[PDB]
Amino acid sequence: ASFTCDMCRAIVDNVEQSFKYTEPTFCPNPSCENRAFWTLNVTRSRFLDWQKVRIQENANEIPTGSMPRTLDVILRGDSVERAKPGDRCKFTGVEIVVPDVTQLGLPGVKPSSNSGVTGLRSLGVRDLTYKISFLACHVISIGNERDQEVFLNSLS
C-alpha cells in the first residue's frame, strides 16, 4: 500500500498489510502534524489476485457417513481459478489463523457482536478470535483444442 497525507502532499510507500486494511500511523515529513488522515494512492499501491475457495472432506473418506468437515482455502496470483465447483483437488501451502478483522478494529466498520483473547492494546475491551484457513501456493485437480498445431505441439 501507499498513501498521501491530507495536510501535506508527502507519500508513504511499501506499507505492508495485515489482515485489516492498514494505514500509516506517522507522517514521514518532520514538519507535519498528521496521524491517521490519508488518501490511498491506487496507482502506486500494488494489489494481488485473491480468491477464497471452500473445500469439504472427500465423500469416500468420511468414516461412517456423518457430516463432512470443511475448510477455507485462499488462492492468490497465478494460482486463482484453477479450482472449480465439484472438482476434487490437492493443494499445498500454509495452515494459518485468520482473525476476526472486525473485532480487531477496522475503518468504516462497527465490530462484531467462543471466548477470545484480550488485553492487546488494539482491542481495548474486545477479545479477538481466529478461524483456520489454508493459504495455498499451488493447486492441481485429481478428479476443444480443435487445430492440429495446438494439439501436436504439446506432445512428447
Partner: protein, 597 residues
C-alpha cells in the same frame, strides 16, 4: 524462614500433594485395588504384584506418548493417596497440574535412576497429561448445581454435534515495528500480557510491539454439545444439554450420535451484554472442561477351518432359533462371505431376496444377518422414519440413504414389494454398478453404495399362490427380480410333520439355555480380511459346461457371473485361496435350485 507453595483457598501444601502422588505413581501395586473392590479373594500375586503404573509408564515411554489413564479408585486403594483423591475431586486443576508435572518428572527420573539411555531432550521437550476417570457417581446433567462450579464431575449422555477444531492461543508472538526484535509471551488466564515498551534497552520504543498472529503458538480446542440421555429425563419435558470443551489429542474423541461418558471439571464463566463493553450478565455460562472420555483367534480359526461339516455347521449357526430352511441359511451364509473385486467394475457383492407369505420367519432372518454383519443396516422399502433408502438433497446438504450407509455391509430391506417406483429405478445402478449418480447443487458424483442387499418381499394380499409364478404373486417387476443371485419362497402351508416340529423347536427356547454363533462374526471377519480366492483353470471349464447346461435347459451371463461370485464366496468359506471344482459345483447347484423358483 521460607515461602510455602499452597493450593489457594485450601492450605494444602503442594510439596505434600506432589510426594503423596509420586509414592503412588511409583510403588503402587494392582493387588491393592482388589482389596478395595468386591471379590477380594481373586487377588493373585503372579498377576497383581506388578508395579502397575511403572508398567504403564514403561509401555507409554516406549510409545513416546503423553497421556496416562487413571481410574480414581486406585488412589483410594493406597494409604498415602486416599487424601489425594479428595483433593483431586475438590481442587482438580491444581492437583491435575501437579500430577502432570509429576508424570513428567517420573519419566525424566526413570531414564537416569533406572538409568537406561534415552533421548532426555525428547522428554524435556514433551508435555505429559494424566486423565483421571471413574471419579465418582455419574450424577445427572439435570442434577448439577452451583456447588459443583470447580469440582471434578462425571457425566453420561449423547453427542449431538461438535465444532471443527478451534485454534486457542497458548503463546503470543510479538515483533517490534522499529527494530524487528521478537519476544514470546505466554497467554495467562486467556489474557495477552502485551509488552508496553520494546524489551531491548538499546531500542525501548513505547507502543511499538505488534502481534504476529501466524507466528503465535496455538493449542487445539473443540466444543461438543452433549444431550441428556432419555434414560434420565422426567417423562413430561425436553431433555437438557451441556456444552463441553475438549482439548489437544482429546479433540475428536467422539462423533455425532456417540453415547459417551466424560470426566471433567465443571466450570462457569460470565458472558457479555455486548462485545463493545465490559459489562457482564449476572449469571454465568456453564460447561464441563473434560480430562477423560469413553464410549457407552487364529488358532481356533484354522482349527475350525479344517472341518468337513463346516458349510452346514456355519449355515445352521446363523439362526438356530429358526426352524429348518436350510438352503436359505446356506445362501445367506454365502452372501455374508461374498466374492472378490478386480481393477480394470466387477465386485464381490451377492444379493438375495425372500418372498412368500408375510407371517413367517423371513423378518427374523433379516434381523439375524443384521446383527451378524459388521456394518450393515435394517430398513424397509418405503418412507423415512428419519432413515431412508436413497441419497437425498435436503437442508443445503446431501444426505446418504440406507443403501449408501450400508457400504461394505448387508443392507436388509423388508416390505421390498411395497417399495416406491423412484426407489425401484434407483436400485438398478447399485445392482449393476454398486453406485448412485448425484448431479445437483454444483456437485456431480457417482456416490458408491457397495452393499449386498438381502430383500424381504410379500405377495399381494394375505396368501401366496404357488400355482402362479413369482412375478404373478409379487408386486415388483421381473427385471429388478432378475438381478438377485438367489431368490427364495417361504410359505405357511399347513403340514403337521413341519408345523409340530417347528412349534416344539420354538416352545423349547423358553426352557433350554455345535453352534459357534458368537465365533461366527470372528470367522467372517478373518475370512474377509485374509482370503481372496482366484479361479482355478479347471474351474473355467466347469463354469462353462455348467452354464451351457442350464442354457440348454434360458440362462444369461448374469447367471454365470453369479456362479463365479458364489464360488468365490464358497472359497472364502473353508479359508481356501483358490476356487475349486467343488466350489463351482455348489454355486451351480444352489443357483440351479434358485432359478427353478
Amino acid at each position: 524462614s521460607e515461602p510455602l507453595r499452597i493450593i489457594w483457598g485450601t492450605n494444602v501444601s503442594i510439596q505434600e500433594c506432589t510426594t503423596n502422588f509420586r509414592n503412588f505413581l511409583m510403588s503402587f501395586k494392582y493387588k491393592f485395588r482388589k482389596i478395595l473392590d468386591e471379590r477380594e479373594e481373586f487377588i493373585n500375586n503372579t498377576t497383581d504384584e506388578e508395579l502397575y503404573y511403572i508398567k504403564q509408564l514403561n509401555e507409554m515411554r516406549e510409545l513416546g506418548t503423553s497421556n496416562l489413564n487413571l481410574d480414581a479408585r486406585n488412589l483410594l486403594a493406597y494409604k498415602q493417596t486416599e487424601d489425594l483423591y479428595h483433593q483431586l475431586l475438590n481442587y482438580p486443576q491444581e492437583v491435575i497440574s501437579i500430577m502432570d508435572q509429576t508424570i513428567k518428572d517420573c519419566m525424566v527420573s526413570l531414564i537416569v535412576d533406572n538409568n537406561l539411555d534415552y533421548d532426555l531432550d525428547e522428554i524435556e521437550t514433551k508435555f505429559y497429561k494424566v486423565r483421571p476417570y471413574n471419579v465418582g457417581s455419574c450424577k445427572g446433567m439435570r442434577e448439577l448445581n452451583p456447588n459443583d462450579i470447580d469440582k471434578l464431575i462425571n457425566l453420561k449422555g449423547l453427542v449431538l454435534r461438535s465444532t471443527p477444531v478451534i485454534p486457542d492461543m497458548k503463546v503470543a508472538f510479538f515483533k517490534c515495528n522499529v527494530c524487528d526484535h521478537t519476544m514470546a509471551v505466554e497467554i495467562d488466564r486467556g489474557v495477552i500480557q502485551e509488552p508496553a515498551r520494546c524489551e531491548r534497552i538499546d531500542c525501548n520504543e513505547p507502543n511499538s510491539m505488534s502481534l504476529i498472529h501466524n507466528r503465535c503458538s496455538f493449542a487445539d480446542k473443540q466444543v461438543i454439545k452433549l444431550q441428556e440421555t432419555p434414560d434420565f429425563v422426567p417423562d413430561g419435558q425436553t431433555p437438557h444439554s451441556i456444552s463441553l470443551c475438549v482439548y489437544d489429542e482429546l479433540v475428536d474423541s467422539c462423533r455425532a450420535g456417540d453415547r459417551i461418558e466424560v470426566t471433567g471439571t465443571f466450570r462457569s464463566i460470565p458472558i457479555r451484554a455486548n462485545s463493545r463493553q465490559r459489562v457482564l450478565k449476572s449469571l454465568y455460562k456453564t460447561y464441563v472442561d473434560v480430562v477423560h472420555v469413553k464410549k457407552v483367534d487364529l488358532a481356533k480359526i484354522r482349527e475350525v477351518a479344517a472341518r468337513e461339516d463346516l458349510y452346514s455347521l456355519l449355515a445352521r449357526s446363523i439362526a438356530p432359533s429358526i426352524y429348518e430352511l436350510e438352503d436359505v441359511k446356506k445362501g445367506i451364509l454365502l452372501q455374508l462371505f461374498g466374492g472378490t473385486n478386480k481393477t480394470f467394475r466387477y465386485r464381490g457383492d451377492i444379493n438375495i431376496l425372500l418372498c412368500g407369505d408375510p407371517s413367517t420367519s423371513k423378518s427374523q432372518i433379516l434381523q439375524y444377518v443384521h446383527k451378524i454383519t459388521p456394518r450393515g443396516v435394517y430398513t424397509s422399502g418405503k418412507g423415512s422414519s428419519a432413515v431412508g433408502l436413497t441419497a437425498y438433497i435436503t437442508r443445503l446438504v446431501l444426505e446418504s440413504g440406507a443403501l449408501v450407509l450400508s457400504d461394505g455391509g448387508v443392507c436388509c430391506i423388508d416390505e421390498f414389494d411395497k417399495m416406491s417406483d423412484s426407489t425401484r429405478s434407483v436400485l438398478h445402478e447399485v445392482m449393476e454398478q454398486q453406485t448412485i449418480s448425484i448431479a445437483k447443487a454444483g456437485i456431480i458424483t457417482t456416490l458408491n453404495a457397495r452393499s449386498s442387499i438381502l430383500a424381504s418381499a410379500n405377495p399381494i394380499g394375505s396368501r401366496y399362490n404357488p400355482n402362479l409364478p413369482v412375478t404373478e404373486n409379487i408386486d415388483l417387476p421381473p427385471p429388478l427380480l432378475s438381478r438377485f443371485d438367489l431368490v427364495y419362497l417361504v410359505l405357511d402351508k399347513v403340514d403337521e410333520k413341519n408345523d409340530r416340529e417347528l412349534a416344539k423347536h420354538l416352545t423349547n427356547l423358553y426352557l433350554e439355555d455345535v453352534l459357534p454363533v458368537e465365533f461366527l462374526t470372528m470367522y467372517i471377519s478373518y475370512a474377509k480380511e485374509h482370503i481372496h480366492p482366484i479361479i482355478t483353470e479347471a474351474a473355467k471349464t466347469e463354469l462353462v459346461r455348467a452354464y451351457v447346461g442350464m442354457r440348454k435347459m434360458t440362462a444369461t451371463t448374469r447367471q454365470l457371473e453369479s456362479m463365479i461370485r458364489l464360488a468365490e464366496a464358497h472359497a472364502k468359506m473353508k479359508l481356501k485361496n483358490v476356487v475349486e471344482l467343488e466350489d463351482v459345483q455348489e454355486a451351480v447347484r444352489l443357483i440351479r435350485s434358485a432359478i427353478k423358483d
